[PDB]
Amino acid sequence: GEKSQAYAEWKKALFQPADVILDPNTANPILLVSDDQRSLQRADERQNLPDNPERFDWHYCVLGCKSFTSGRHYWEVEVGDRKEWHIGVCQENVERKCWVKMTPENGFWTVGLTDGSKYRALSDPRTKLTVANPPQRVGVFLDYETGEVSFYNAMDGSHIYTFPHTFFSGPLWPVFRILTLEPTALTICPA
């Protein structure tokens, strides 16, 4: 398809493919990280984990294993028919233990889905998205220098959302959040 091909070529012209794996030491104790570190599920209740300082205690979040301090990066996430998910990037210095709202002001740039059909950007206030075809696979695109975080339907190349250009402070991490206990996992596409 021409739109698929143009999407493939744009990613190659401009963005380094990140090979993102989930860091289980950061995962909220209700999350399960797969042994291959590409997939995420949710437990029925908090499991017994050591509360190391990096772990998200409150928000159902996990980070990637590598951060970005510069340049243009993308990765793709198989959200499949999940009813609920949010993905994007967050600053190294985000609050991990106490509650904070997951907003750019607090160092989170994420978009996703609630209740099967409600797409939102987690701006403050939240941005209601209108998405013609529900994505099965989402591309996350970072340009550190221009402060750009944008999201695409990775199967048809359609744009989902771009946050206002911002100024990042410190390293950015891929972040993933699931609130629900449902059959479809969240899975990272390898580079």
Largest CA distance in the chain: 49
Radius of gyration of the chain (CA): 16
- Per the CB < 8 A criterion, the answer to whether 78 and 154 are in contact is no
92 belongs to the binding site for a copy of itself (CB under 8 A): no
Q: Does 147 bind a copy of itself (CB under 8 A)?
A: yes
Query: Pick from 99, 72, 102: which is nearest to 88 by CA?
Result: 102
Selected binder of a copy of itself within 26, 28, 150, 187 (CB under 8 A)? 150
x/- mask, a copy of itself, residues 60-89, rule CB under 8 A, reads ------------------------------
Tell me the closest approach of the beta carbon of residue 102 to a copy of itself, in angstroms: 18
Cβ atoms within 10 Å, residue 111: 26
Residue from 100, 129, 179, 189 touching a copy of itself (CB under 8 A): that is 129
Question: Which 8-state DSSP code applies to residue 62?
Answer: E
Separation of CA 131 from chain center: 18
Evaluate whether 52 touches 110 at the Cβ level (below 8 Å): no
Binding residue for a copy of itself (CB under 8 A) from 14, 43, 181, 191? 14
Strand partners for 72: 143
Query: What is the smallest separation between the CB atom of 27 and a copy of itself, expressed in angstroms?
Result: 31
- Report if residue 93 touches a copy of itself, rule: CB under 8 A: no
The smaller minimum CB distance to a copy of itself, of residues 104 and 174, is found at 104
Q: Contact residues for a copy of itself (CB under 8 A)?
A: 2-3, 5-7, 9-10, 13-14, 125, 127-130, 132, 145-148, 150, 156-159, 161-167
